Design a protein around this ligand. Structure first.
Ligand SMILES: Nc1ncnc2c1ncn2[C@@H]1O[C@H](CSCC[C@H](N)C(=O)O)[C@@H](O)[C@H]1O
Ligand code: NA
Lengths: 265, 265
């Protein structure tokens, strides 16, 4: 009579925690969703092969609207798992599902997994220096999202880094690139003109974290906006005031321009 | 010729990822450090057993001062593993170790694992609403550090949550409790009178994240300050103004008082 929210990690099926694999292996029913993020280094088959169970993949609608009609019911008489990319409660609304579980008299547990939210540490940027986070959403019709631009502004004013989750349309198989995010940022700059994002702004790109060779790059927008960072997923980071050691790492590991080593205190 | 930075996860020996365990098992030498943090739900013995390798522990001085003399030499002719609690490179100084590897002509790769930075998602608080993070340090002698107080003030002022790491004397295996942290904050409030921390301030406590049975509690300092949250480690969070969905979660899952649905939303 239990429901397990188990994270699968960043890139491939091996990013799952041992705890997660052992518990999933013994669950009667295994559900999962692959719309909140993209695990570029694996397939549904490989995950099934690793867990030894058939996995019923759910759509956003199946979850957001019928989680308690598709998953919870079985959880009352069985050990059920619900898998998700990265960590199941980071930058998703899956947390609210634990409430649905409670109201259906189902016990739920959470098994964490490596998340892009902490994996940003590989960029060399002090993780405690990150401020509010935001998402760069794809413009739709006449609707053009811009809130993420103000978030960057507020963080930068306080010298804090800004982590930018990039949009994803799983059904359309669309994964926003750091390039598309930079384009959208420049366009919003022309509108708000707050001097938040310009050709000379320093940015950091992390692509395919979790893989053995993620792409880690830092540089000025003017130089990175057209660079090829490889297959998605990508996140874009707008650093605040750098610490000298953050700069050295960006230069030594992310190929950033040597000149950023000279910080203006 | 290869150095692997492998994260051990949140609480016990099963919190390492499958990728990290397999790679660790294939390494000729395996180092670890338990000065940045400890794995409160396991032992060096249990981890050694799981990896099936002898694990040489390294002190803070071993890493910070002689990493290139103890670890890198061996990595030039073998596959070496360097294990750390949580997610690698989250501990402020570890990133520059990758620069040392580069200069020693050694290749390095990062194998991620869950970190408390993403694990706090289990509190039900939206991850994007967290602002700058801080650590609560014990006063001693004539030194009374209080920057963590200003961090809270600046985040809350912008409706952002503040993740507070509590002091730890790893070597002496001593932890600071959420209780002690709350007492310190009131003491600081009294000194700085900035109206940031009072008996009526809402806070969240997360203990033993990673365990299947963590302690998640939310309430006003006046009611939680002397509450027993159990064995360490403890994580204290000072939430900013809450979104209704966050409050409902704290109420239904963390046992927070209904009062928050009207007072803190
Ligand atoms: N391996 C990876 N590399 C780079 N960005 C990633 C990533 N995994 C997720 N993301 C980023 O996060 C977005 C999904 S947001 C959901 C995040 C997920 N629960 C987690 O814990 O990571 C993606 O569109 C992308 O911008
Ligand atoms: Na943060």
């Amino acid at each position: 009579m239990v429901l397990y929210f188990i994270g699968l990690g960043l890139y491939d099926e091996r990013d799952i925690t041992v705890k997660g694999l052992e518990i999933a292996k013994k669950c009667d029913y295994v559900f999962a969703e692959f719309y909140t993020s993209l695990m570029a280094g694996t397939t549904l088959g490989r995950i099934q092969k690793l867990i030894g169970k058939e996995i019923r993949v759910l759509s956003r609608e199946d979850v957001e609207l019928n989680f308690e009609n598709i998953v919870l019911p079985l959880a009352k008489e069985n050990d059920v798992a619900f898998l998700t990319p990265g960590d199941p409660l980071v930058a998703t609304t899956h947390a609210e599902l634990r409430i649905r579980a409670k109201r259906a008299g189902v016990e739920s547990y959470v098994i964490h997994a490596p998340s892009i939210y902490s994996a940003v540490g590989i960029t060399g940027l002090h993780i405690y220096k990150f401020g509010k986070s935001a998402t760069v959403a794809y413009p739709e019709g006449n609707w053009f999202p811009t809130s993420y631009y103000d978030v960057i502004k507020e963080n930068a004013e306080r010298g804090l880094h800004t982590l930018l989750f990039l949009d994803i349309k799983a059904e359309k198989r669309m994964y926003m690139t750091a390039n598309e995010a930079m384009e959208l940022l420049l366009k919003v700059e022309d509108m708000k003109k707050g001097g938040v994002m310009t050709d000379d702004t320093l940015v950091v790109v992390l692509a395919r974290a979790g893989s053995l060779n993620p792409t880690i790059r830092a540089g000025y927008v003017k130089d990175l906006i057209r660079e090829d960072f490889g297959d998605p997923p990508h996140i874009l980071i707008v650093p605040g005031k750098l610490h000298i050691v953050e700069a050295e790492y960006l230069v030594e590991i992310a190929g950033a321009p040597r000149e950023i080593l000279r910080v203006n205190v």
